[PDB]
Symmetry: D2
Subunit: 217 residues, 4 copies
């Protein structure tokens, strides 16, 4: 087995939001079978960011989702080769983001390569004015489709003046080799920003993430 | 107590799907504080239906959602006056449905009046070809907004040739009198068709529905 | 040919916007082959309306669209039997409307029966606060699909304090019996509110609508 | 004065579609005040492309749009500094694309830098199976919003076996310096693939694009 009880990872993101180009690099670690992982990020180019860090936080590790024995762990089974993941984030005020990523395993460490493009965010909106205060804990709905695994989430960012800023996530997970696909299931996640410097150029995150069947089944 | 341990309801739906006009009348019952109810429906006009019954099933009782003590039960608190609910159902193949309903209390019995309009369903699609096999259990994401309660769900209809037919639900719950609104929370639901006649003109449904905080909190 | 150079019509709408029920009845007339028609409406029940009239204005006659000889006039050809039309109106601030209609012909007079359900409009939004000042002239993109005619438009309502309120229209035109379908084409339209009383309970409208190929063809 | 009657351009694209990375370089020319331009493209990395070329064709020069004297030419006025343009392409089968671009003027030649991310395209769909055969001529609806110029289009890809594959374009044009914005208007366009080799690694395109008021005004 190539996936140990403790695994480290390296991540690199090249992105663009409302015309602003940036590059982020980071290191992370966690326990794949327990559903715990952490990551320390640094904005290497284009810093400081003129937008909310929160839109970038869920783009930095679903191989770390704790899966019970009866639910095929598609993402873990895809290794050593790995998987690719794609995403559409539809924000309630017109903002749209598409993400494309490659997950590989090189010398016992997971390697993540992310590309991000965020467009149509209002200048006076919560993203461009940094009015967000982290994500609420979420629940993803997953199912097999077109030979790959897909998942959707109704997420929300908490606001400074109170209230929520709603975002719909549509994710696609694609294995680099044909492996076992699960049926209809759910993934609960809670991402927290554990520490950050004043301008968000150095950020530390934590994520608890577990897969399960619906409670009524 | 205005809402008793055991409550009955009467429901009437006037609808249109792909130009086909129909009317449905029903009678139901259940336990509001336990999170479960049943309903028997009869197609009084426009029978037999040339589309999947399943798209109509979740339009026939959220006052029956079991809520913990720490989550304000907005829908129960709205009574004797009651509440109105509205909904948008966005199907993956282009089909769209808007629903509008009024919930009142007349002489110890809940009265539900539903109006349904379903449009843009492909003639060769699972709705018009009756290829659906019930809903999978679901999880609604709720939050307060614009002085009322809103909730969204990523639902799915099971297909007989295998696979899923995806539908996004967007619901709005509006009290007739200003009552206490809850915060961010979730409602798990599971609707089953318990019995039906050959042409789906007489149908019986069961729904278990419970409110809760996200499992990681 | 059952459709003459001058044709009259009568229309009735039963609708609901944000829980508010209403009924509208009207009489109209126009010239089918010239591309223009007029209509006088009166709110028979639910008057005065607490929302903007403008959202109802495009639901009151596409058989009146002028078509050149080289573009099959599907809607005119559908008569004496007639056609049914359905619509989805997606507003930028979340408001969603579905409309279903039946168009028939009785002794030289077209009979229109409309059902309208409008949901999710913000209470402080331009619809519920009556801040709209009529529609801008529009351009519909049409094409045949699933044995019927479809069309989409990027429309906009002019705002009182300046700016626009965007709405995407998705319409489906369905002949009761199969008749010749056109290919890809466009329809230019301009609807005007010619007169109205103070509370919009009596309203007169004018529409100019003509079909054409794209100008670069 | 800076934009001459005849202007040349260089374009570079770094993109990803369904996990497949590619790079495209090209050179074009045309007449800005007349509303027409040409471009020759070469796939420099990731060739041959396993998807339809057509989705990339409209990403390679709106400074070339012929504008009448009464409609402020925002994009031409933005020069020598230039503009940035962003886009969302919503395909009817779930595919989503976000594009971000930078347009500048260097040594009397326009320089275009494009980043493209395409996600959620079905493996058996029109894009991944190359079932498309060019775009139909289109009509963009433009308006000023949030201090910038926005435009939406209901586009369509012609299918090899007949019918259309629908795509909704949402574009945002942002000048690098505060310049005069137009009002509500339209842009007609027709993009043709004039020449290509067997695997689409070398492609030549032509575009005729002109701005105008609605025909009824």
């Amino acid at each position: 087995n190539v996936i140990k009880e403790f695994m480290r990872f390296k991540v690199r993101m090249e992105g663009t939001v409302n015309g602003h180009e940036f590059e982020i690099e980071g290191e992370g670690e966690g326990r794949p079978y327990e559903g715990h992982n952490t990551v320390k990020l640094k904005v290497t180019k284009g810093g400081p960011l003129p937008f909310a860090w929160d839109i970038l936080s869920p783009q930095f590790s679903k191989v770390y989702v704790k899966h019970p024995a009866d639910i095929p762990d598609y993402k873990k089974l895809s290794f050593p080769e790995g998987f690719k993941w794609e995403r559409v984030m539809n924000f309630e005020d017109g903002g749209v983001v598409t993400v494309t990523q490659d997950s590989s395993l090189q010398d016992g460490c997971f390697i993540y390569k992310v590309k991000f493009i965020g467009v149509n965010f209002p200048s006076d909106g919560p993203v461009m004015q940094k009015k967000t205060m982290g994500w609420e804990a979420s629940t993803e709905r997953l199912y097999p489709r077109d030979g790959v695994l897909k998942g959707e989430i109704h997420k929300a960012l908490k606001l400074k003046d109170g209230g929520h800023y709603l975002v719909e996530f549509k994710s696609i997970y694609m294995a680099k080799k044909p492996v076992q696909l699960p049926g209809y299931y759910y993934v609960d996640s809670k991402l927290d920003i554990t520490s950050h410097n004043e301008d968000y150029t150095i950020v530390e995150q934590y994520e608890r993430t577990e897969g399960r069947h619906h409670l009524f089944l």
